[PDB]
Design a protein around this ligand. Structure first.
Ligand code: CLA
Ligand code: CLA
Ligand code: CLA
Ligand code: CLA
Ligand code: CLA
Ligand SMILES: CC(C)=CCC/C(C)=C/CC/C(C)=C/CC/C(C)=C/CC/C(C)=C/CC/C(C)=C/CC/C(C)=C/CC/C(C)=C/CC/C(C)=C/CC1=CC(=O)C(C)=C(C)C1=O
Ligand SMILES: CCCCCCCCCCCCCCCCCC(=O)OC[C@H](CO[C@@H]1O[C@H](CO)[C@H](O)[C@H](O)[C@H]1O)OC(=O)CCCCCCCCCCCCCCCCC
Ligand SMILES: CCCCCCCCCCCCCCCC(=O)OC[C@H](CO[C@@H]1O[C@H](CS(=O)(=O)O)[C@@H](O)[C@H](O)[C@H]1O)OC(=O)CCCCCCCCCCCCCCC
Ligand SMILES: CCCCCCCCCCCCCCCC(=O)OC[C@H](COP(=O)(O)OC[C@@H](O)CO)OC(=O)CCCCCCCCCCCCCCC
Ligand SMILES: CC(=O)O[C@H]1CC(C)(C)C(=C=C/C(C)=C/C=C/C(C)=C/C=C/C=C(C)/C=C/C=C(\C)C(=O)C[C@@]23O[C@]2(C)C[C@@H](O)CC3(C)C)[C@](C)(O)C1
Ligand SMILES: CC1=C(/C=C/C(C)=C/C=C/C(C)=C/C=C/C=C(C)/C=C/C=C(C)/C=C/C2=C(C)CCCC2(C)C)C(C)(C)CCC1
Ligand code: OEX
Lengths: 56, 35, 52, 245, 30, 34, 334, 37, 59, 50, 151
């Protein structure tokens, strides 16, 4: 189980190297942080937001 | 109204997930030839 | 409001909670039979008769 | 309201906002000009009560019983316009155009459904004073047209200006000298126009938008079904909004 | 009052269908 | 004014829906892999 | 040995009295929901404003109907194709006024009868049968989905769905003829050939088997006691039935193959009902039946009427009288 | 209308969409010519 | 000139519609006659390009 | 290819275009996944229309 | 003995119910065999050179600037629906009238500049960008007068 932890470390090493490259490249390309780019894309736009729930 | 909607949504997702994971439960093998 | 464009009719987060909790409950039972199942065990038929 | 005009049609539709009146912000005063005219008067009922004899604890007084609307969100009048006439002392309003009627059906306890044309048609409404104030009171009579027009056919094909004038499924009732005189009230479809009374009361005035808004209370009679049933008195309350120019 | 007869005939028909399914004569070989 | 549209349509119909059976008739005469 | 596997073994068990299966996990809750709501709405439901014009139509037995006239009335025309569950209705009385029970019953019935079809596949798989009994049941399922779902979708309102009643069904048929001329549609003609032929072939095949039964009984007992359940031998002389029907018409027009004959018994009504289900589904989008009105014209130019024109005069009588207060404009485009 | 260099072939173009129906019929001729075997 | 070339392309295509499947479905003729059939394929493909040239030049 | 046709190679016919319906380069396509998958996960019924 | 017409070849042909007489019934040449109309040559009553057709297009171009100039009065308010409706209610006839008046090659490229600014006004109105509507509305006006100042 120690060599599985070594393989879990190495596969996370190779994955997060690709991941931190994308974080560094998106922070340049957007100008903001990643919660601030994902959170703006995982939200509905302000012109698209339904007024909503005016039924008594 | 919206208490009934919770109850129906709970009921529908219960029976639909029984349908989904039941047909994922190695269902081709449940035939009288083998297994 | 019924003509508004909500994902799966979810207008309150109560309904999102019971959708997750309902689907994860049968998933957890189903993982009692098909969790701890080996990923590298293949077969060359049209149908597999692996285990229970 | 300025808020409602910020939205798209696609943001409002389905939500129920389109059946609501605008709320007015502020206590100000507007003095109407000689050419003044209310333009987009919204009148939204928020309570419905039908008069019926009830058996409370030991007696049988007449009570306005609260009833539930079954015609869903189609009840609010809107785009009501008409000139504001300044008399010697008082200020009056004569409505002319707009969606000044809404067919509403309420249900009484017991299952009794009471359809009525909620209307302000031909309203001449007298006020107290000369300016619109947060204590201003406008009120007057209006004409309630019949809920069904003379073109309406009943289940047997009888109406006022069209249709059969006999119970055509019972042809042997047209026999003898008396004929179908026992069925006269159902065969004679009568267009009836009754009177209603609304009492508006301004409590919020926005002078920069030239908008007034307050509450009302109105009473009228319900559908007679072309003179076949006795109508019931329907009391309604709610909110109004208008712009003064 | 005839809706009492209409209800009794329909509910009585469904009770026959219940007994025809769950109290059926089981088909048996030999 | 000899109406060459119906002449053109019915001849081109006849050439086309004979070209298909001509393939199978020729393959039956050639004794091919039908 | 796990809890889910023991539940899976019970669900797919062929030793239950009724097979449940995984389609029964959708079939049994939806159809018992629709059955419970249908019985309550048929017996006791207040009148429904079907045409959206605040003219409520009584459909239940407690509001003065009988078995023939009673119906679960379709939804309001003001609703249209909008989804109207109970929780979108602000009170149950508003839901009952606007024809809410129709949408609940129809959507649970159509889900439940599609799951009834998949249940018919599923038991055949657990029994080792050939699969396609549920393909034959797809023909009445397509017909039920055409008149309850597809024709509302094309016309844009559940108010144009077929009412759940006997007299509402005849109202659905007559208005459909006036607006779409279904009798002159060849897909209804193939459907009539499907049910006339299918009941012909049922009476034909049922005659020739009963005609050629082998002596196994006496004059006192019933003839059906000559068959034992589970016997291996044939119970009727199929050579004698083929020799009869081969002399009734002529020899080359009769099935000697019983497997080809029973396949023809399955195919003729099912394909006929499939085609007429795709007549209703295509008249949903107003691709109507044949219009031969004023097509026969004499030398001066005057119209000579045909039987299609007399059929047209009956279509005109239904359409000027149907939904008599609902129309404000000279064309029924809905 | 077709472009002016090609309006001579306008009757040929009138039969061209029908040719897929002739391909389904061709499979039945070929099966009959082989004798359905 | 375009009308002459398309009329030639129609005639070559009609000859190839009734001779290519005969050459492919008799079990020896394609390998003994495909230089002749590739020659007709190239005259067919070259006719399309010459028509496409003459159509685009005239436009 | 449809995206390339609409954004770069001529555009597509937009019946909603200002000035009248016409061919228009689609310059700002909606990339918000709540809008885009809001069509996939909405109701199929009236008003929604999946 | 009845009137016969095999399609047009044998018999009358010029009879009131013959359907496959493609052009053989009438004297004047048709646009195509599959048409009931004669071509767009002369003898046609529609003259595209005519003064009442040109004046109708110029009246669309003049009133377009009047509708295009009441855009910022909706943008000091926030009636974004009024901006999108103004660009489509009267102005629906603008693209039909501008492309009809754009004959030369510089007219067409000066017309699309007006069209691009018109779509920038619309797209900023859906997005409710207040400064971007007005910055596109003046570009739509300034490209409109540049088109009309040609001819
Ligand atoms: C984990 C999945 C994932 C997701 C959902 C995204 C999502 C995005 N990426 Mg990112 N990216 C990722 C992994 C991911 N990335 C990885 C692993 C790398 C390294 C190869 C990158 C390298 C990358 C670059 C260089 C850029 C993006 C950009 C973007 C944005 C494109 C905007 C759009 O709407 O399309 C979007 C937020 C673009 C962006 O941020 O524009 C502002 C951009 O320029 N990504
Ligand atoms: C077999 C079980 C079953 C099913 C399928 C239904 C179905 C329905 N019921 Mg019924 N109901 C049932 C049993 C069932 N019922 C029972 C037992 C009762 C008594 C408690 C009821 C009581 C009841 C009432 C009172 C009402 C309904 C109503 C409804 C309708 C809408 C309900 C809804 O919005 O749920 C919510 C549904 C979901 C959230 C959908 C879940 C489906 C999942 C998300 C699958 C999607 C997969 C996805 C696309 C994959 C993409 C993956 C990819 C992105 C990677 C629907 C037809 C309503 C109705 O009839 O309206 C007219 C209504 O008013 N039901
Ligand atoms: C008087 C007798 C009679 C006859 C001969 C017909 C015949 C027909 N009816 Mg009609 N019909 C009738 C009375 C009749 N009907 C009555 C009393 C009613 C109720 C009022 C109807 C109501 C009705 C409706 C609503 C429709 C028809 C239709 C039809 C057609 C197809 C039905 C079908 O296939 O059935 C099943 C029959 C078979 C499967 C057997 C085939 C019968 C054919 C005709 C025999 C062919 C023999 C052949 C030429 C011989 C070749 C072999 C030879 C060498 C020996 C068919 C032409 C349909 C239609 O209009 O189609 C265009 C249709 O929609 N019928
Ligand atoms: C003699 C003349 C004649 C004949 C033979 C027919 C025959 C037919 N008509 Mg036509 N029609 C006619 C005259 C005729 N018509 C006339 C004169 C008119 C104008 C008024 C019409 C107008 C008309 C319309 C509008 C329609 C028809 C349809 C049909 C078809 C109905 C059968 C069907 O599809 O059921 C199929 C089976 C079902 C629909 C039932 C499905 C069963 C479900 C799946 C399960 C039900 C279970 C149940 C709830 C519980 C069971 C009990 C339980 C205890 C187990 C059939 C081909 C219908 C059609 O073609 O639909 C496709 C149709 O919509 N006709
Ligand atoms: C042999 C190659 C070839 C091809 C494919 C074409 C094709 C074309 N040329 Mg021509 N051209 C050619 C040779 C060719 N030409 C030669 C040798 C000359 C002399 C130098 C010219 C000179 C010429 C001029 C002066 C003009 C053309 C024009 C055209 C276009 C005519 C329609 C049009 O207005 O464009 C509009 C665009 C289209 C109609 C798009 C057509 C393509 C669509 C997407 C269909 C393709 C679908 C797909 C590939 C089919 C499925 C295939 C299969 C895999 C299933 C057309 C795309 C005109 C042009 O280019 O206009 C811009 C034009 O003005 N050509
Ligand atoms: C000398 C002078 C003066 C000269 C005058 C000249 C002159 C005399 C002329 C007269 C000629 C004249 C008209 C005579 C011809 C006679 C004639 C045919 C007249 C009748 C007219 C007429 C047009 C008749 C046509 C009607 C007809 C025959 C229709 C039948 C069509 C037909 C093929 C039906 C088959 C349908 C079918 C496939 C059903 C089978 C399906 C089914 C369920 C079968 C059941 C079944 C079948 C089995 O098989 C077996 C085994 C079993 C188990 C079984 O279940
Ligand atoms: C081929 C056959 C024909 C195919 C049918 C095509 C399906 C149409 C596409 C459906 C759209 C799917 C989007 C998600 C669903 C949706 O949003 O609905 C969600 C809608 C929205 O729900 C309503 O939304 C309204 C807002 O507009 C209001 O909020 C209402 O209150 C709310 O109820 O509700 C329903 O339609 C309920 C669906 C019930 C589904 C249960 C049956 C499924 C059983 C099948 C078994 C599962 C196996 C399939 C799994 C994969
Ligand atoms: C001029 C126009 C040209 C048109 C060209 C064709 C257009 C498309 C037509 C499609 C024909 C497809 C042929 C399919 C054959 C097939 O079914 O075999 C299946 C079996 C095999 O036959 C059995 O076959 C067995 C031998 S074997 O299986 O074939 O090897 C044999 O043992 C047995 O006796 C025999 O009965 O056939 C039979 O059982 C008899 C039924 C035949 C019915 C098909 C006729 C068409 C459908 C009927 C009408 C539809 C119902 C709707 C009415 C409302
Ligand atoms: C929740 C969001 C997380 C998602 C992150 C998105 C990043 C995606 C991963 C990128 C790098 C992965 C390496 C991590 C390292 C890691 O641990 O990964 C592990 C993963 C699978 O390896 P495992 O050992 O986990 O198991 C793989 C199997 O053998 C099953 O056991 O490898 C990949 O998926 C790498 C694929 C590279 C693909 C890149 C090539 C793409 C180029 C286009 C190809 C052209 C095709 C045309 C044919 C010529
Ligand atoms: C004895 C002692 O003293 O110590 C011991 C015990 C102790 C403490 C337990 C230790 C340990 C174990 C440790 C420290 C384990 C790991 C810790 C860590 C921190 C592991 C991160 C992995 C991140 C990954 C794979 C990111 C992928 C990200 C990818 C692929 C992206 O796309 C990036 C992303 O931004 C974008 C581009 C797009 C978005 O759509 C998605 C997101 C937002 C994700 C020690 C030190 O080892 C030893
Ligand atoms: C594009 C083009 C082209 C091409 C085309 C082609 C040519 C195609 C082909 C075609 C084809 C592809 C054809 C086919 C045909 C077929 C047919 C015509 C068939 C039919 C038949 C019948 C129908 C009969 C049948 C039968 C038999 C045989 C026996 C049994 C019975 C029955 C009856 C079934 C060309 C060159 C012109 C040139 C121009 C352009
Ligand atoms: O809903 Mn049942 O019927 Ca179809 O058309 Mn329009 O809408 Mn109403 O009228 Mn006619």
């Amino acid at each position: 189980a120690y060599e599985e932890k070594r393989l879990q470390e190495l596969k996370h090493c190779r994955l997060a190297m690709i991941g931190v490259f994308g974080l560094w490249a998106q922070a340049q390309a957007s100008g903001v942080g990643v919660t601030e780019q994902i959170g703006a894309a995982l939200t509905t736009p302000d012109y698209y937001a339904k007024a909503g729930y005016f039924l008594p | 109204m919206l208490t009934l909607k919770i109850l129906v949504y709970t009921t529908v997702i219960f029976f639909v997930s029984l349908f989904i994971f039941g047909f994922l439960s190695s269902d081709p093998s449940r035939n009288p030839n083998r297994k | 409001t019924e003509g508004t464009n909500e994902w799966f009719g979810v207008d309150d987060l109560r309904l999102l909670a019971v959708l997750f909790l309902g689907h994860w409950a049968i998933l957890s039972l189903w993982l009692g039979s098909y969790g701890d199942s080996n990923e590298d065990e293949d077969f060359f038929g049209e149908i597999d008769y692996s285990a229970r | 309201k300025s808020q409602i005009n910020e939205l798209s049609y696609l943001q409002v539709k389905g939500t129920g906002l389109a059946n609501r009146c605008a709320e007015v912000v502020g206590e100000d005063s507007i003095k109407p000009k000689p050419g003044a005219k209310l333009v987009d008067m919204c009148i939204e009922p928020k309570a419905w009560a039908v008069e019926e004899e009830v058996g409370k604890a030991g007696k049988t007084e007449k009570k306005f019983v609260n009833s539930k609307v079954m015609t869903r969100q189609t009840y609010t009048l809107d785009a009501i316009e008409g000139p504001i006439t300044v008399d010697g002392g008082k200020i009056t309003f004569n409505e002319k155009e707009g969606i000044d009627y809404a067919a509403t059906t309420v249900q009484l306890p017991g299952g009794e459904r009471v359809p009525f044309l909620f209307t302000v048609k031909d309203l001449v409404a007298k006020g107290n004073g000369d300016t619109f104030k947060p204590g201003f009171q406008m009120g007057g009579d209006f004409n309630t047209p019949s809920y069904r027009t003379g073109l309406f056919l009943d289940p047997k094909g009888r109406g006022g200006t069209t249709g059969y004038d006999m119970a055509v499924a019972l042809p042997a009732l047209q026999l003898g000298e008396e004929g179908d005189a026992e069925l006269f009230g159902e065969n004679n479809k009568v267009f009836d126009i009754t009177q209603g009374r609304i009492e508006m009361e301004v409590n919020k005035v926005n002078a920069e938008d030239s908008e007034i808004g307050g509450v009302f209370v109105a009473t009228q009679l319900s559908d007679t079904d072309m003179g076949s049933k006795t109508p019931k008195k329907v009391l309604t309350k709610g909110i109004f909004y208008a712009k003064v120019d | 009052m005839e809706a009492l007869v209409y209800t009794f005939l329909l509910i009585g028909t469904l009770m026959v269908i219940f007994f025809a399914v769950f109290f059926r004569e089981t088909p048996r070989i030999l | 004014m000899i109406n060459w549209q119906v002449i053109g349509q019915l001849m081109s119909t006849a050439v086309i829906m004979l070209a298909g059976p001509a393939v199978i008739v020729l393959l039956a005469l050639k004794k091919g892999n039908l | 040995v796990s809890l889910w596997e023991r539940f899976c073994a019970w669900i797919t068990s062929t030793e239950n009295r009724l097979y449940i299966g995984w389609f029964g996990c959708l079939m049994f809750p939806t159809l018992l929901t629709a059955t419970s709501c249908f019985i309550i709405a048929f017996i006791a439901a207040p009148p429904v404003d079907i045409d959206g014009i605040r003219e409520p139509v009584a459909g239940s037995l407690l509001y003065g109907n009988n078995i023939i006239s009673g119906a679960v009335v379709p939804s309001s025309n003001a609703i249209g194709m909008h989804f109207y569950p109970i929780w979108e209705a602000a009170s149950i009385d508003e839901w009952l006024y606007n024809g809410g029970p129709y949408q609940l019953i129809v959507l649970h019935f159509l889900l439940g009868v599609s799951a009834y079809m998949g249940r018919e596949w599923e038991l055949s798989y657990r029994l080792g049968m050939r699969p396609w009994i549920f393909v034959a049941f797809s023909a009445p399922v397509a017909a039920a989905s055409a008149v309850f779902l597809v024709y509302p979708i094309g016309q844009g309102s559940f108010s144009d769905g077929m009412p759940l009643g006997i007299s509402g069904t005849f109202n659905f048929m007559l208005v459909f003829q006036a607006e779409h001329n279904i009798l002159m549609h060849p897909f209804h003609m193939a459907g009539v050939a499907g049910v006339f032929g299918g009941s012909l072939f049922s009476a034909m095949h049922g005659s020739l088997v009963t005609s050629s039964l082998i002596r196994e009984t006496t004059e006192n007992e019933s003839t059906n006691y000559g068959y034992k359940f589970g016997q291996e031998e044939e119970t009727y002389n199929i050579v004698a039935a083929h020799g009869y029907f081969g002399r009734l018409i002529f020899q080359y027009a009769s099935f000697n193959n019983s497997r080809a004959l029973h396949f023809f018994l399955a195919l003729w009504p099912v394909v006929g009902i499939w085609i007429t289900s795709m007549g209703i589904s295509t008249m949903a989008f107003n691709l109507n039946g044949f219009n031969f009105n004023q097509s026969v014209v004499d030398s001066q130019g005057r119209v000579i009427n045909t039987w299609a024109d007399i059929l047209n005069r009956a279509n005109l009588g239904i359409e000027v009288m149907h939904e008599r207060n609902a129309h404000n404009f000279p064309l029924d485009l809905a | 209308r077709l472009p002016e260099a090609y309006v001579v072939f306008s009757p040929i173009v009138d039969v061209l969409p029908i040719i897929p129906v002739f391909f389904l019929l061709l499979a039945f001729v070929w099966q009959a010519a082989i004798g359905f075997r | 000139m375009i009308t002459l070339l398309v009329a030639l392309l129609v005639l070559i295509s009609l000859g190839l519609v009734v001779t290519v499947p005969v050459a492919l479905a008799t079990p020896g003729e394609w390998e003994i006659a495909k230089g002749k059939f590739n020659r007709f394929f190239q005259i067919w493909v070259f006719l399309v390009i010459v028509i496409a040239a003459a159509d685009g030049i005239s436009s | 290819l449809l995206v390339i046709k609409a954004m770069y190679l001529g555009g597509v016919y937009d019946t909603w275009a200002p000035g009248g319906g016409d061919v228009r380069y689609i310059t700002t396509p909606t990339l918000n996944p709540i809008v885009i998958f809001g069509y996939v996960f909405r109701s199929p019924f009236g008003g929604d229309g999946w | 003995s009845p009137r016969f017409s095999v399609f047009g070849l044998v018999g009358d042909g010029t009879s009131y119910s013959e359907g496959a007489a493609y052009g053989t019934d009438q004297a004047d040449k048709l646009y195509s065999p599959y048409s009931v109309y004669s071509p767009e040559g002369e003898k046609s009553l529609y003259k595209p050179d005519n003064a009442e057709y040109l004046a109708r297009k110029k009246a669309v171009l003049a009133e377009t600037k009047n509708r295009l100039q009441k855009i910022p009065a909706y943008v000091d308010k926030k009636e974004w629906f009024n901006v999108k409706d103004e660009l489509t209610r009267y102005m629906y006839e603008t693209r039909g009238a501008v492309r009809s008046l754009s004959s030369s090659v510089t007219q067409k490229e000066k017309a699309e500049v007006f069209f691009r600014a018109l779509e920038d006004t619309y797209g900023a109105a859906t997005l409710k960008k207040g400064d971007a509507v007005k910055a596109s509305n003046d570009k739509a006006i300034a490209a409109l007068d540049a088109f009309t100042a040609t001819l």
